[PDB]
Amino acid sequence: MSRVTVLQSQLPAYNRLKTPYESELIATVKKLTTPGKGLLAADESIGSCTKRFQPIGLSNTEEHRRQYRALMLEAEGFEQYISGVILHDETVGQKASNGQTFPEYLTARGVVPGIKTDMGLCPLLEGAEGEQMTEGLDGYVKRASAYYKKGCRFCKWRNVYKIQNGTVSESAVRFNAETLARYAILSQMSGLVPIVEPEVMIDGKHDIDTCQRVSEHVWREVVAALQRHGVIWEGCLLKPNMVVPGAESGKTAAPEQVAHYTVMTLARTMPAMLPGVMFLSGGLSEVQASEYLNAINNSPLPRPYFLSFSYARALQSSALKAWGGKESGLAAGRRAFLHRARMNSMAQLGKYKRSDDD
Amino acid sequence: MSRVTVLQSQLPAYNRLKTPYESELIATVKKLTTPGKGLLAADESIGSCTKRFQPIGLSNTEEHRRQYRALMLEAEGFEQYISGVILHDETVGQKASNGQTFPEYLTARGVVPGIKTDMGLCPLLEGAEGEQMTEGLDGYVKRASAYYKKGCRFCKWRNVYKIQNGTVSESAVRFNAETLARYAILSQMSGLVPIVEPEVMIDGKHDIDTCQRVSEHVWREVVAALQRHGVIWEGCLLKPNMVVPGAESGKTAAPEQVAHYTVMTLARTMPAMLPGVMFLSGGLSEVQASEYLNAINNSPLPRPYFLSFSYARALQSSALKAWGGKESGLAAGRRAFLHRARMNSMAQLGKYKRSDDD
Amino acid sequence: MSRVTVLQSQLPAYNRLKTPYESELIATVKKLTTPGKGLLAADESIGSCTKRFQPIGLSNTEEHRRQYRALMLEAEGFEQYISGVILHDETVGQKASNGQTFPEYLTARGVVPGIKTDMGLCPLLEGAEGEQMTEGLDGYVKRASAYYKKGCRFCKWRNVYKIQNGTVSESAVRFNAETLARYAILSQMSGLVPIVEPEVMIDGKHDIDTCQRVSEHVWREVVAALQRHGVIWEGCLLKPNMVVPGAESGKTAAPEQVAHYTVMTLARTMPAMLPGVMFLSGGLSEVQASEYLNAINNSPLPRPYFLSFSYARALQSSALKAWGGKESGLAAGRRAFLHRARMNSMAQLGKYKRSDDD
Amino acid sequence: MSRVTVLQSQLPAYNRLKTPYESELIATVKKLTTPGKGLLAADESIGSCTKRFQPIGLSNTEEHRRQYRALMLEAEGFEQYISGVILHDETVGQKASNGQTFPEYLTARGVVPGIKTDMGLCPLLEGAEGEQMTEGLDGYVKRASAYYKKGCRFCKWRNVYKIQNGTVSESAVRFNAETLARYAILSQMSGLVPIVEPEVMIDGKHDIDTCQRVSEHVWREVVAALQRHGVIWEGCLLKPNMVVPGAESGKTAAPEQVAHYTVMTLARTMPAMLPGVMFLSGGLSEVQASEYLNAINNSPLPRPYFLSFSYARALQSSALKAWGGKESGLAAGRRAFLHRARMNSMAQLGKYKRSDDD
């Protein structure tokens, strides 16, 4: 019969995140889920830029990295296909040729500036050898708030899961899901729409069925963690891997099959309220990235969420090659970029034509 | 580096239920999610008919209960609005006028026969006073297999949650969710599509927001348990309460508000793969049940699943009174039943018109 | 800001079971944890009696089963070594030679009457082939209440875990723990001290390290479930398997090794408040059961709980053979039973001498 | 059906932490659980010294803080009552009078040097207003490894829980438990014995029963998280609050009552393998800390673990006053310090006499 007066916030059923940024997060989500548009992931680390530049003989310097981002961001008309850009910490403070910082340059053109906020992969130290966790939660709100003041309105955090012997440890499944969930809450509290990226890596000899089982298992726990932390579903996005056979499996998957497996897996795990799913391109070729997204947007399976792209190499490869790191290559580089952006825009609408890439 | 060969079934990622009935379950779900059709819940207990028959001066006997069910089951043309019927254990063994058992009779008319398989509510004995659990898992497969052989292809199991002081105990949330999840698995293994009913009762003075918060909390855990038990999402259905203010709150929500709160809550908790949601009427009037379902099917919020009805009193109330328990009242009783069935059929399609109703 | 008045019982931190039987449960635990005494498990099913009787040519009839129990229960002097007897449902209503029901007979002679309340093993239908769940929770309180009125003051429920390929499925680990936890709560509410038996079976070719890992994993989850259900720790007992190599492993284990592994595993999982641990004999010989218990009670490792026995075959094997199901064998049969009871009483005290068993 | 070869480390039952430092961690625990000895907590922050040094009129400077620690660290014969010292980051790099860094100095005197490794409290941003999380996991191994190279062999990390309205949010209970569990694993992997401190703060008007309920709830989840992360129980220690009434409750508990509640709560949550419990004394007077620890070590309740102290103010308070921050006060200050140390040494042995104090 003993009754006690407590705070509503101390009751399990009243744990939904409370933030004054809710309306803005929703508004940002709306912009990021615009039909025919997707995201450009230009958040490559300095180390990743080394790999990008090696093939074209461009030294990896701050000025060259600025020019690398400018190649894409200053491509006239890209906003027709790109709704948001995931920037690297360094780039947020750099400037376009006109004096505008990149976030200002994007915002001026209706493109939402985003920021990769995780601090990289580290050994998990639990589970199986080779598994990794992601650092970055300490001091997160301080960093996120600084990015917000600079114009960023969304962010991205990547956790990886490595399929070994057809499985992944429960230690990794649980720990990385909790990391992603905490990241999502801290982001929303800071005014940034969080793009949750639980990437089941393509590396390995596993077949598509194994990727499907592991992906469903991994993503289901990510959702469970988000529910426990009280995420605002209306204000977040997912950036998952498509379900495909392992890179060293030696097997192939028709776009129709990839679409079936991918859409089926998302539907079995994701709440219907999830606003959007922006696929990572991972180890996919530029063409596969477009073909798969197109098939996904032609799937008869349940898919209430906006299904689009958040590609890095799949949107940059040809452009970098055509550019060659030379001013005289800007025009060719930009034509290549806009072409890939257009193809993926069409794929988002389910109207991509393979003959356009011939 | 120690390696070990195990059964795939012993790995967490490979826990999806394996049943030879999978294809048939999916086929049954397809029938139960037919546009413009809903379910008739005729699984009232033998004891409950004593008070139900009181107003019409009908003695509660087996033969009279048979006639009560025949009033609706033998109403020619009801199959245009009803895709399946949840039968009571007793009725499964009773016969229609033509000699066939009701399950055989229904099947011949394209209506799927179902059976309520739970064994009633009992004190939870954990959590708060007044909370209840549902019994029935012991010997379940044996019972379900027998119903299957008699023609049943789907079942229903009800758990209830009582809102007291604006909340429910975690003991009830966890335990009832686990019961529902185990029930779903045993049903699918037995060849019966399970209708999972986690009813947050309308009883109380709570407002609509409290119902929203508790319903979201309760349903989220039901989904979590279903995921842990490895349910075949493609072969199950949900029978939830609509999100409305308490029966003693002194408030009555407008159709659009009920639709908003209900669809939002389902979307934040249910996987997009869930094939259907057949609402219970609880303590709603016959007209409210139609008005609310219509508004729900006009909601702009995400809703990949089939949204329909699984009504008991909301379909039988007027019919029972017109019937009066007399054979001469069958014509009037059936006209009333078919009217309500038609109103809800149109509500499923989102074309319900209040003016066409009394 | 928002404050709400709720029932203390609706708060997670106040979930400890509330029962007017608490003081009596604790008093019963005290009797069952008396130095030099252990439990006699005489709850063999009718089917198990067939296996027990076959070797001595005794037909499996109700009267012969009564005589089988009388052989032990009326063996004057066994009370010095046995604090409680786990009876089978049938025996609870049978009478001793003096006209008293067995529970009345035992109580009058200083022994606590107990009862096996589970309803047997059934296929788990989740996880790996061969795994099993235990039925019996439906209608439990009604059954337990009836046994209490008959004089029973404690009960026993057995769940089993089968090591296959060096592991067990998470489905089994979670489900069976949940079953045991709910059983414990219902028993305490009914006035019966629950003996929780999570038996990791000896069956298989696994080694002792594997038994250790699986036992620790299984027991840890049982404890987790008991904590979630708010069990009264001072009013329950555990009946676990000892940690030993698989029966088909072909490997040997010295008593001191079994003691190290067993005590270490219990300490890593059991709360220090657990009042007692009464080991099952499983697939151990009569002498091994005594030798191992003796070593366990000479272990330098942490062990705040009373460590004793709850043996069936380990106390009955030789007695049954000497008895031969004949009146003329009662003397020899009882001599054998009392000898084994004495050896295990000595082992509980850590004073067992292998030389005493020739 | 299908079989698969996986890494043993990918199976749930084989999640125990694997570190080459196991033997050393266990050896360090043995030293820290020496009869008659406890820990000195000298990990106060640099900022706190400003107000701490205010009473004695000592300016807060690096040099003065060094003298403050040297007061007790260089006190002759304190190693008779102190087995280890929790150092502050700054102090690890400071030198004793003979030129040796304090870690080298303590190691030479047989005292184990430890280090507080957490990075402070921050808003939880989930749950109820006022609740806090603890940061520091990012880059933990790098920092811990550096401390290990300097001589540290154990560490401390503190999480707090605030009782408000007689309860705490599940958000705090779960998140802080996970933080403590991850901290423990990272510490063991780095070669430092982790001292897990889940402090239910004494602040508030709550009574002793409320502190009991919350402490049991909080600690049970900490244990649950530790089990999930696979901690080496043999190589970790607990630093919990004693179970007492709130500081503003207007009530003071008797030593015997605090002992009952505290020991009972530990027994109901802590596994029997936990090697030691080193109580914090926040909120208690120098005398109470001794009286309470003494009563605890005279409790008839189960307590297999070493029960001692890990006091800061309760050991330094009087010494600081007698020292006055002057060279002429060292002699007196050290007499007061060694006195309190001796008193608690006796309390650990349960031979404390209140007549020895005021």
* A224 vs B contacts (CB less than 8 Å): 224, 227
CA distances from D267 to B311, C272, D244, D263 (A): 52, 5, 16, 6
- C-alpha B12/C-alpha B15 separation (Å) is 6
The dihedral through the CA atoms of B177, B179, B183, B185 has a sign that is positive
D167 has a chain C CB within 8 A of its CB: yes
Q: Which residues touch D355 (CB under 8 Å, ≥6 apart)?
A: none
C6 has a chain A CB within 8 A of its CB: yes
Our measurement of the distance from residue D139's CA atom to the centroid of its chain's CA atoms, rounded to an integer in Å, reads 22
- C-alpha C20/C-alpha A299 separation (Å) is 60
Our measurement of the distance from residue B6's CA atom to the centroid of its chain's CA atoms, rounded to an integer in Å, reads 40
Consecutive H or E run containing A42 = strand A38-42
Q: Are A12 and B217 within 8 A, CB to CB?
A: yes
Residue D239: DSSP 8-state: -
DSSP string, B57-82: T----HHHHHHHHHHHHT-TTGGGTE
Q: What angle do CA D138, D143, D146 make, to 5 degrees?
A: 160
Residue B181, both tokens: 């999840």
- C-alpha D255/C-alpha D297 separation (Å) is 11
Consecutive H or E run containing D259 = helix D255-269
Domains held by chain C: number: 1
- C-alpha A195/C-alpha A235 separation (Å) is 9
- C-alpha A341/C-alpha A40 separation (Å) is 9
Helical residues (DSSP H) of A270-357, grouped into ranges: 286-296, 313-323, 330-348
How many C-beta neighbours within 10 Å does residue B199 have? Answer: 18
* D274 vs C contacts (CB less than 8 Å): 272
Residue D301: DSSP 8-state: S
* B10 vs C contacts (CB less than 8 Å): 127-128, 164-165, 167-169
Q: Which of A108, A112, A139, A134 is nearest to A123 (CA)?
A: A134
Q: Are B208 and B162 in contact (CB under 8 A)?
A: no
- The phi and psi torsions of B16 (rounded to 5 degrees) equal -60, 135
- C-alpha A53/C-alpha A325 separation (Å) is 8
- C-alpha D352/C-alpha D358 separation (Å) is 13
Residue with tokens 């008839």: D300
B270 has a chain A CB within 8 A of its CB: yes
User: Residue D182: helix, strand or coil by DSSP?
Assistant: helix
- Rounded to the nearest 10°, the torsion over CA B69, B70, B75, B81 is 30
The dihedral through the CA atoms of D56, D59, D64, D65 has a sign that is positive
Q: Which of B51, B50, B53, B29 is nearest to B39 (CA)?
A: B29
- C-alpha C53/C-alpha C30 separation (Å) is 35
DSSP string, C6-57: EEGGGSGGG-----TTHHHHHHHHHHHT-TT-EEEEE---HHHHHHHHGGGT
Residue A74, both tokens: 């200053």
Q: Are D273 and C302 in contact (CB under 8 A)?
A: yes
User: Which chain A residue lies closest to B171 (C-alpha atoms)?
Assistant: A12
Our measurement of the distance from residue A280's CA atom to the centroid of its chain's CA atoms, rounded to an integer in Å, reads 6
Q: Are C216 and D13 in contact (CB under 8 A)?
A: yes
Helices (H) and strands (E) in chain B, counts: 12, 11
Q: What is the resolution of this structure in A?
A: 1.6
Residues pairing with A307 in the sheet: A277
CA distances from A62 to A49, A58, A66, A119, B147 (A): 10, 12, 6, 19, 73
Q: Which residues touch B244 (CB under 8 Å, ≥6 apart)?
A: B202, B208, B211, B253, B258, B261, B284, B292
Residue with tokens 């329950």: C236
- C-alpha B299/C-alpha B256 separation (Å) is 8
- Own/partner contacts of D341-344, CB < 8 Å, gap of 24 or more, are D341/D38, D341/D40, D341/D78, D341/D80, D341/D81, D341/D82, D341/D315, D342/D80, D342/D81, D343/D290, D344/D38, D344/D81, D344/D289, D344/D290, D344/D293, D344/D308, D344/D309, D344/D311, D344/D314, D344/D315
User: Residue B309: helix, strand or coil by DSSP?
Assistant: strand
Residue with tokens 């709160």: B261
CA distances from A127 to A104, A130, B298 (A): 43, 9, 48
3-class SS shares of chain A: helix, strand, coil, % to 5: 50, 15, 35
Q: Are C233 and D268 within 8 A, CB to CB?
A: yes
User: Which chain B residue lies closest to D11 (C-alpha atoms)?
Assistant: B11
Q: Are C181 and C136 in contact (CB under 8 A)?
A: no
Residue C340: DSSP 8-state: H
Q: Name the pairing type of β-strands B121-123 and B132-134.
A: antiparallel
- C-alpha D233/C-alpha D22 separation (Å) is 11
Q: Are C273 and D302 in contact (CB under 8 A)?
A: yes
Q: Which of C225, C10, A224 is nearest to B170 (CA)?
A: C10
> Chains touching chain A at 3 or more Cβ pairs under 8 angstroms?
B, C, D
| Catalytic choice (B44, B74, B131, B197) | B197
- C-alpha C70/C-alpha C78 separation (Å) is 12
D130 has a chain C CB within 8 A of its CB: no
- Cα end-to-end distance, chain C, whole Å: 76
- C-alpha C81/C-alpha D274 separation (Å) is 32
Residue with tokens 């007066």: A5
Q: Are B171 and C127 within 8 A, CB to CB?
A: no
Burial class (CB in 10 A: 0-12, 13-18, 19+), D213: buried
**Which residue numbers of A are catalytic?**
197, 239
Burial class (CB in 10 A: 0-12, 13-18, 19+), D325: middle
Consecutive H or E run containing C86 = strand C82-87
What amino acid occupies position C59? S
- C-alpha B149/C-alpha B272 separation (Å) is 32
Q: Are C241 and C191 in contact (CB under 8 A)?
A: no
Q: Are A128 and D230 within 8 A, CB to CB?
A: no
- C-alpha A322/C-alpha C298 separation (Å) is 79
Burial class (CB in 10 A: 0-12, 13-18, 19+), A339: middle
Q: Which of C288, C351, C348, C356 is nearest to C38 (CA)?
A: C348
User: Residue C276: helix, strand or coil by DSSP?
Assistant: strand
- C-alpha A344/C-alpha A291 separation (Å) is 9
- C-alpha B5/C-alpha D139 separation (Å) is 36
- C-alpha A104/C-alpha D285 separation (Å) is 59
- C-alpha A303/C-alpha A277 separation (Å) is 10
Residue D8, both tokens: 């043993």
Q: Which of D346, B143, B232, C282 is nearest to A216 (CA)?
A: B232
Q: Are A8 and C11 within 8 A, CB to CB?
A: no
- The phi and psi torsions of B225 (rounded to 5 degrees) equal -65, -40
Residue C110: DSSP 8-state: T
- Cα end-to-end distance, chain D, whole Å: 75
Q: Are D6 and B8 within 8 A, CB to CB?
A: no
Q: Are D112 and D73 in contact (CB under 8 A)?
A: no
CA distances from D323 to C179, D85, D251, D311, D335 (A): 62, 20, 33, 19, 10
Residue A25, both tokens: 């997060």
Whichever domain contains D196, its CATH number is 3.20.20.70
Residue C358, both tokens: 């020739």
User: Residue C162: helix, strand or coil by DSSP?
Assistant: coil
* Residue range of the domain that includes C166: 1-358
Residue A159, both tokens: 């956790």
- C-alpha C246/C-alpha C213 separation (Å) is 13
Q: How many CB pairs under 8 A join B and D?
A: 35
User: Residue D198: helix, strand or coil by DSSP?
Assistant: strand
- C-alpha C56/C-alpha C68 separation (Å) is 12
Q: Which residues touch D4 (CB under 8 Å, ≥6 apart)?
A: A165, A166, A167, B5, B6, B7, B8, B11
Q: Are C185 and B133 in contact (CB under 8 A)?
A: no
Residue C117, both tokens: 């309340």
Q: Which of C165, C217, C266 sits opposite D12 (nearest CB)?
A: C217
Residue with tokens 């076959």: C54
Residue A356, both tokens: 């356009």
Q: Which residues touch D119 (CB under 8 Å, ≥6 apart)?
A: A138, D134, D135, D136
Helical residues (DSSP H) of chain C, grouped into ranges: 22-32, 46-53, 62-73, 89-92, 102-108, 140-149, 170-189, 208-228, 255-269, 286-296, 313-323, 330-348
**Which residue numbers of D are catalytic?**
197, 239
